[PDB]
Amino acid sequence: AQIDLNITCRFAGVFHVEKNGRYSISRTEAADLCKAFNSTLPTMAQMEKALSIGFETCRYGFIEGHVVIPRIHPNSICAANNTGVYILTSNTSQYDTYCFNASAPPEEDCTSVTDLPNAFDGPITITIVNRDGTRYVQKGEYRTNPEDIYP
C-alpha cells in the first residue's frame, strides 16, 4: 500500500533512493521516481563525479544505460570488494535507483527533503525518509506504468 522512499544526501546532485527497504524498483518506476524528485537518471559521468567527492552505497540502482553500485572502500558484501562506479552485467531484476538533480550544489547537500515535490494526485501514503531518519508523509502517486502498480 504505502510507499517509503529512503534517500541519501545529494553529492554533486546525485542521490540514492530505496523503496520499502528492499530491491523493488523497475526501470520504468525508476524514471518516474526521479521525475517526481525533479530529477533524472544520472549519467555515468555524473556518478563518477559524485564518487570522487565521497558518494558510495552498498546498493545497486538504475542510472542512464546501466545498473551500478558506487564503491569507494572495498567491502566483500558490496559488489565483492570491487571499486568504482561498478557496472552490473546481469541486470534484469528490480533494484534501487539513483537520481540526478540539476539545481543541487556541487558538494554534499543534506537539507531535509520534506515532500515528493513533483508527484501528482493519488491515494498512496508516501513517506520521504531522510538520511538522518526524519520522516515526512503525504498522499499522492508518482507511477505512470500500469505494470508497476498492478503486477
Binding site: R10, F37, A102, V113
Partner: peptide
Amino acid sequence: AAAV
C-alpha cells in the same frame, strides 16, 4: 521550483 526544481529542487529535490
